[model samples]
Every structure is written in structure tokens, then in C-alpha cells.
Target: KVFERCELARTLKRLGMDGYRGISLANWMCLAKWESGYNTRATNYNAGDRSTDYGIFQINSRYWCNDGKTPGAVNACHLSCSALLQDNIADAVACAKRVVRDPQGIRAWVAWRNRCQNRDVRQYVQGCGV
Candidate 1:
């Protein structure tokens, strides 16, 4: 947990111009709490066969390494974790900013929230402005 916090801050600092400036540390911490409970090793059951989603950010294996070719061939777990472990808070925060910058992906997050909200599951928190 201590290492997690340290890396998160380091990553955020590296984000620089691409980072979410207005976002507070508390908000980042809250997100870390929800996403992976600050556990870099967390994996989701929703991850399809190969089940390669990993890290506090849960960066899908396909996104970083899989390329949709092989299932779970690329072990994104450590790579993803190291990204955050290298800078936990910042990497996660930067990822949020990067996601919002993607026009199509932004809507995906919105749709995801809407789906959850519609189901009366308000546990999902909206990230600060794109």
C-alpha cells in the first residue's frame, strides 16, 4: 500500500501537461480505492479467457500487449502493475485524462456509468472533466 501511494504520485507527476491538474489527491485515492482497492495485482472475472486485465488501472492486456491476437499470451498484470508501481497515482490519473481525450472512449466511460446508474448501482464515480 505504501509503495502504491508512492508510485501513484510519481506517475501523476510525470503526466505533466497531459495530467489532470484540477483533480485532487483525495479524488485519486478514492479512484484507487474503487478500481483495485490499491491492489496492483487485482484481476477481474469479467476479463475474457486468458483473463489478462491487471494492475490498479486494470489496463486490459489487449490494450498494451495482446493486440487481440493471443489470449493471455502477454502477461499485462506485472506490466500494468509496474506502470502504477513505477508511479501509481499519476499513471492512473494520466490514464483517466488520456481516456477522456479519446472521443469514442469518453462515451464508453459515460455509457458504462449510465448502465450502472440505471441499475441503481451508484458505486461508480465519474472522473473529473475530460
Candidate 2:
């Protein structure tokens, strides 16, 4: 399902990710907004690196989800890249949680570093009541 920004916030809260292990809800909101504009069908290919990013969190085709053309991907999610393009976001969310545990933490996303770092993103959900 295509999620409105606020709906995504509420879902994250319900999933116990609102304040997960010091990860901020605001950070998540910013990431999703900048990464996919809340569209599940979002996909980005960077010719410079021959990599693609899938779905809202934009899991990389190089080391994460595979786009078939990207051979030998690590595919840590153990699922097809198309799986992330579906309206349902559960699988994508599950994978994103694991990514947060990586050594770079949320910095695995360039969007996060550029938009969310050191910024007070509480406004992303201020009126959403999440």
C-alpha cells in the first residue's frame, strides 16, 4: 500500500520502532520522505556504481536486494528485489531494521546522512500524532 507520511509514522509506532534502541522516529520519517516520497514502486539506478536502490528504504542492489540484472548480490534479505515494490511494506520494514544494525547504522543511506543528520526532524510527524 502506498503510505501517507503520517500513516507510515503510525505504522512504525505500532511496530515498536518509534524509539527503537535509540533510533528516532523523526529520522525514519525523514529517510522515507527523501528516499521514496512514500511510494512503494520507487526504484533508483545509479549508473556510476551500476547499482539500484529498491522500495522506500532504497536497499542497494549491489549488496542487499537483487534486481536480477545485478548478479551475485549479497541479498541479505533473501527475497526478490521486486518484493519490495509491493504496496505492503512489512518485508521492507523488516529488512530496514536489520540494516540499522549494520556498522554504519542509519548512515548506510546517503539520504539519511544528507537530510537527517543533526537535524531536528520532529516536524516530520508533529501533527501526525505519532
Candidate 3:
């Protein structure tokens, strides 16, 4: 499912991402926009690490979800990597929360650093009415 911008903003806000762990909904919006372009089934495989990123948040199999193939994965999210690919984003949202609970916070996602961090992200949710 590729969500419209405002639709995804409202959805993330309803999911408590508005101020989750001190990260704004806009930042989360920025992350999702870059990570998966709001596409629920997006997937990216890292040939270098032999791990894959999945879903809107692109939760990685190497540290978050377990695909039963990534080497030395801890599966901290405690769910199958396939769960992140579902059209229903509940599991993906939960895993995203877990990922941020770590010290890295949103920095856990490199894309956030390169694309969202310290940048003007207000445009992501500017007209979402979120």
C-alpha cells in the first residue's frame, strides 16, 4: 500500500508517533518518506551484510526482525521480518518504537541522519492536519 502523504501522517499520528520519544511526527514522516515513500511492502536487501530492510520503516533483519537468514541477528523486535511487509502497519509501528527505545533513538536509521536530521522536515506534515 502506497499511502498518500497526509494519510500516512494522520496514521502515524494516530499511532502515537506525534511525539514518540521526543521525535516529532514530522520527523517520522520524513523518515518514512525517505525510507519507503510510504509504501507498506517496500524491501531492500543489503548484499554486503546479507540482511534485508522491510516495510515502511525499513526495519532491518540484521537487528530488528528475524528472517532466519541474516547472520548474528538478535531479532530484538521479536517478530518475523515478513511481518513488516504487511499492508497493516501495526507490527511495523511496534518494531519502530522498539528500535527507538535504544540509545540511538531515530538515529538508528541512517537515512534519518542523512535525510531528516537537522533538516527542515515540517513540509512532510505541513498540510496533513495532524
Predicted model with the maximum TM-score: 3
For candidate 2, write residues 45-108 as lDDT tens digits.
Answer: 8887778898988888777776778756678877788888988788888778878877887888
The digit string of per-residue lDDT tens for model 3 on 10-42 reads 988888888899999999999999999999999
Total backbone clashes of candidate 1, pairs 3 or more residues apart or in separate chains: 8
> What is the lDDT of every predicted structure here?
0.45, 0.83, 0.93
Q: How close is candidate 3 to the true structure, as a TM-score?
A: 0.97
**Model 1: runs farther than 4 Å from truth?**
2-27, 45-49, 65-97, 104-130
Off by over 4 Å in 3: none
RMSD of 1: 7.3
Model 1 TM-score is: 0.44
Model 1: per-residue lDDT, tens digit, 1-130?
4334545544444555222444444444444555666676666544355544445655555444333444545532223434643323455445555554555532323323443323433222324231
TM-score of each: 0.44, 0.91, 0.97
Alpha carbon lDDT at 125, candidate 1: 30
RMSD to true structure for each model, in Å: 7.3, 1.4, 0.7
Model 1 scores a C-alpha lDDT of 0.45
Which wins on TM-score, candidate 1 or candidate 3? Answer: 3
